[PDB]
């Protein structure tokens, strides 16, 4: 899959993911949602090898939902990200590794803080104010390094995100058919239906 972006502002985490699915010669779909809700206040976007992406994401989703039911409790974003990292670190020395990169955006209800974690297919985890996978960071990070403030509102975050997508649409060779944008905050997860 292609572009996945993330930004952590004052009170929320925003994830932006491209809509295109291309199988070699043709664009088979232009409305694909490259994300799974792991828990009410935790969202994971993904990109990598075909098939393995959705298989890994749904596998993680099933496991977190199982934990939620067993304990009647939502794991913190930090705890979910650690579980995901271990699964990918385990996978990289398997017979056939999951070739999947993820961003985990969650709102910690205990600390009242948004949190964004970036994890690649090797199991390399970092907590960041903003992140990306693939070539997305090469085009967007110089804009984020300039404009980002830790006290930004959600609206200001969306505006900075629009500038990033515009730069991608200008300089990237591939047509990724726009992005689906989702916000994670104290009230849960919602999709911005006009972007």
């Amino acid at each position: 899959m292609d572009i996945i972006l993330g930004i952590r502002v004052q009170d929320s985490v925003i994830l932006a993911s491209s809509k295109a699915v291309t199988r070699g010669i043709s664009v088979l779909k232009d409305s694909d949602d490259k994300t799974r809700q792991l828990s009410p206040h935790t969202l994971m976007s993904f990109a990598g090898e075909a098939g393995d992406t959705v298989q890994f994401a749904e596998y993680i989703q099933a496991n977190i939902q199982l934990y939620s039911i067993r304990e009647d409790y939502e794991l913190s974003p930090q705890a979910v990200s650690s579980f995901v990292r271990q699964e990918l670190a385990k996978s990289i020395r398997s017979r056939r590794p999951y070739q999947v990169n993820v961003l985990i955006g969650g709102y910690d209800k205990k600390k009242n803080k948004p949190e964004l974690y970036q994890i690649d297919y090797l199991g390399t985890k970092v907590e960041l104010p903003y992140g990306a996978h693939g070539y997305s960071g090469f085009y967007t990070f110089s804009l984020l390094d300039h404009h980002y403030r830790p006290d930004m509102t959600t609206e200001e975050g969306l505006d900075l995100l629009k500038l990033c997508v515009q730069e991608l649409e200008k300089r990237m060779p591939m047509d990724f058919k726009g992005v689906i944008v989702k916000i994670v905050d104290k009230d849960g997860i919602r999709q911005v239906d006009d972007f």
């Binding site: 304990e71 409790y73 794991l75 913190s76 930090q78 705890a79 650690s82 579980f83 271990q86 205990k110």
Partner: protein, 244 residues
């Protein structure tokens, strides 16, 4: 063949009871009494060593109170060797959880895991059950201070105050009488020692016959401290509470 010599450790009686579980509970009723009391500002664990000797090296001795991690401790009643098998498994489970989620294991999840292991030995495998009852004293940031017990059946329950081992009927009645919800650790320390002093089968309660531990947020600021009392420290708290 071999069937002839099989005791069949995992069968129901006609009344629907598990023979071996019931008999293991009978064994535990002869072990030294262990008591746990939960207060608002901490938990107390107090336990009686079984008829000791003057030549026993007490300061290096441990038969009752064990550390599972920095936040959770257990009091043991029953076969000590059986307990150490389960204790080591619990220590590993706690570390497995910490590695997986990067957070300390919640108290109940550790308790449920050990209790499920006990359950398995009652349903399959044809082996004898563990002759052990545990009192779990622990803290996590979800439920705070917690007390649990588990027995050879693999059943577990939560408690404000509880006893296991010998004379639990007498001990539980004494605890039920003097326990109050707004109680503090220093008061709970006194209640635990007073209850052991009355229920003991020994002539008098002295420092060399006791193991003592507290779990306090009496650790400088937003954290929890475990204190396994030394022989001299058990001697001092016995004088302070006016038992010796």
């Amino acid at each position: 063949g071999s069937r002839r010599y099989d005791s069949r450790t995992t069968i129901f009686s006609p009344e629907g009871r598990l023979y071996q579980v019931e008999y293991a509970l009978e064994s535990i009723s002869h072990a030294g009494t262990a008591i746990g009391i939960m207060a608002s500002d901490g938990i107390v664990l107090a336990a009686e060593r079984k008829v000791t000797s003057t030549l026993l090296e007490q300061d290096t001795s441990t038969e009752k109170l064990y550390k599972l991690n920095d936040k959770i401790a257990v009091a043991v009643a029953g076969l000590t060797a059986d307990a150490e098998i389960l204790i080591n498994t619990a220590r590993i489970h706690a570390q497995n959880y910490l590695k997986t989620y990067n957070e300390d294991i919640p108290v109940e999840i550790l308790v449920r895991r050990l209790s499920d292991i006990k359950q398995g030995y009652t349903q399959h495998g044809g082996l004898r059950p563990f002759g052990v009852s545990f009192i779990y004293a622990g803290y996590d940031d979800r439920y705070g201070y917690q007390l649990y017990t588990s027995n050879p059946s693999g059943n577990y329950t939560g408690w404000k105050a509880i006893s296991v081992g010998a004379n639990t009927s007498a001990a539980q009645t004494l605890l039920q009488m003097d326990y109050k919800d707004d109680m503090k650790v220093d008061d709970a320390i006194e209640l635990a020692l007073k209850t052991l002093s009355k229920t003991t089968d020994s002539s008098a309660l002295t420092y060399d016959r006791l193991e003592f531990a507290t779990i306090r947020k009496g650790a400088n600021d937003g954290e929890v401290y475990q204190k396994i009392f030394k022989p001299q420290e058990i001697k001092d708290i016995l004088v302070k509470t006016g038992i010796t």
